[PDB]
Design a protein around this nucleic acid. Structure first.
Ligand SMILES: [Mg+2]
Ligand SMILES: [Mg+2]
Ligand SMILES: [Mg+2]
Ligand SMILES: [Mg+2]
Ligand SMILES: [Mg+2]
Ligand SMILES: [Mg+2]
Ligand SMILES: [Mg+2]
Ligand SMILES: [Mg+2]
Lengths: 56, 117, 55, 151
RNA sequence: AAGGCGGCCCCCUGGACGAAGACUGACGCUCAGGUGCGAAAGCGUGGGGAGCAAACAGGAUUAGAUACCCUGGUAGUCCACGCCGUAAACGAUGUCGACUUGGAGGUUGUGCCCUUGAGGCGUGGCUUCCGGAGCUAACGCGUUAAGUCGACCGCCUGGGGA
């Protein structure tokens, strides 16, 4: 996420724009996922469980 | 002593600590401050307030060079990601750009085992 | 019909950071999302498209 | 206060100047259900405060009260095992109640000859913002600006 | 085929499926014994070694703590050529064939129709969720059967001992 602060735009709006760009790019989510090792069996188990949850 | 005016706000936000380094545009360090070095330990070290004071101590340590405008570079997760940028603007700096530079491997090294707590 | 040389069309299916946009967002067909990803990767290698938003 | 949503008991005004705010103040100072001796201390303190500050008995109270009145305070909350202090904007009614409570408590902690003298010298210290009561609003402020991130 | 297989490019190569005819003329199904393949760990020889990490060392926690947590870290994890032949090797469901109401998707062929920068109507292969009869001890299964039948094989016969 690369955010460029615009003319006559407050700091509060620029930071909120950055926080949304990080949320869109999944910055904190990709760091949470890579922090610790996950077994192929575990990531396959998670993918199956999420696919079942995506049925309402 | 010298004159820069246009700088770079390099902030290393880890889960345990926040290291704030003010550098020039080329990547040469001018002054730094950390949450751990600002009189905060363990429980209080890993707080956005300890990161706010780290941005404040860093601002006092670089105003002899005389910086007016600086572009922010955010690395890592944890607290002090946004509280450092907030403390830099309130200190008396014009934020040029806010960029996330968190390292993301294209699936490289095997991370350490999950902590069984 | 899809080609790595057509960096014009290719730029519509990649994000601000250079990441390939998933089929769920773009609404493309399964067969052609695979054809796209190959072309984006072919164009990335040939420095016709970037890998990351750093360089 | 789990299910029942209650209001607030409207107390009778001050028998001297007809002020509801002073009636809250006399009650805050009041101990052992002795209202007679409680207003006697509040009036003697106001009589010695206005005389030694240039009249306006109601206005001299308001000058001392404006300095102790807090704007923001922290609220204790336990999210995930950890106790986070969330800064919350205090309502105008409680703004005055905290201001009055700290004046009474700081005057009680004083070493003067009488409670009327202790109260008057506490209101005099608050009017010029240099006492125990104004420092309680100061400590509450430093606590709020610190946890400003968790707002 | 199972084990398993994921950046990109080429070379060598196996299988599957569709459309249209032509050709062979029961050449088929199953398979004890036999043969081959077969995750990870482990073994042998020589390489390689960034990260991770059995063992081991140190710091903590605890009543103890040969653990969980932290700082390190050797084999190993990687490559070549051999070996080993096991897993909750699982759909805990042997293979092949025929027959039996339906609904909503996903994926991959193909015939047709339109002025199409998409859809409309069919017809194959695979796949997911739901469900009818029937089946089942129940849970559930339900044209990808655990339904209705047939061919052949493997296997079970109370728990522990094993
Ligand atoms: Mg003939
Ligand atoms: Mg070896
Ligand atoms: Mg360890
Ligand atoms: Mg060995
Ligand atoms: Mg066995
Ligand atoms: Mg039924
Ligand atoms: Mg069913
Ligand atoms: Mg027996």
């Amino acid at each position: 996420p690369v955010i460029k602060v615009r003319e006559n735009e407050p700091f509060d709006v620029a930071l909120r724009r950055f926080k949304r760009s990080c949320e869109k790019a999944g910055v904190l989510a990709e760091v949470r996922r890579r922090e610790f090792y996950e077994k192929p069996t575990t990531e396959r188990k998670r993918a199956k469980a999420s696919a079942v949850k995506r049925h309402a | 002593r010298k004159q820069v005016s246009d700088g770079v706000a390099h902030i290393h936000a880890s889960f345990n600590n926040t290291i704030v380094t003010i550098t020039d545009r080329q990547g040469n360090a001018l002054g730094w401050a950390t949450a751990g070095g600002s009189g905060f330990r363990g429980s209080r070290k890993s707080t956005p307030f300890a990161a706010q004071v780290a941005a404040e101590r860093c601002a006092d340590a670089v105003k002899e060079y005389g910086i007016k405008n600086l572009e922010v570079m955010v690395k890592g997760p944890g607290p002090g990601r946004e509280s450092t940028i907030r403390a830099l603007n309130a200190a008396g700096f014009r934020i040029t750009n806010i960029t996330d530079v968190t390292p993301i491997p294209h699936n490289g090294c095997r991370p350490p085992k999950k902590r069984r707590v | 019909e899809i080609d790595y040389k057509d960096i014009a069309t290719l730029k519509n299916y990649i994000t601000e950071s250079g990441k390939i946009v998933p089929s769920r967002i773009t609404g493309t067909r399964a067969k052609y999302q695979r054809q796209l990803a190959r072309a984006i990767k072919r164009a990335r290698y040939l420095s016709l498209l970037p890998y990351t938003d750093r360089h | 206060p789990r299910r029942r949503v209650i209001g607030q008991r409207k107390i009778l005004p001050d028998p001297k100047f007809g002020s509801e705010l002073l009636a809250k103040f006399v009650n805050i100072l009041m101990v052992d259900g002795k209202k007679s001796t409680a207003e006697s201390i509040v009036y003697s303190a106001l009589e010695t405060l206005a005389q030694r500050s240039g009249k306006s008995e109601l206005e001299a109270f308001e000058v001392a009260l404006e300095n102790v009145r807090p704007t923001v305070e922290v609220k204790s909350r336990r999210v995930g095992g950890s106790t986070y202090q969330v800064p919350v904007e205090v309502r105008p009614v409680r703004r005055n109640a905290l201001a009055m409570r700290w004046i009474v408590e700081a005057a009680r902690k004083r070493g003067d000859k009488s409670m009327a003298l202790r109260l008057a010298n506490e209101l005099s210290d608050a009017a010029e913002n240099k006492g125990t009561a104004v420092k309680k609003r100061e400590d509450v402020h430093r606590m709020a600006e610190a946890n400003k991130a968790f707002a």
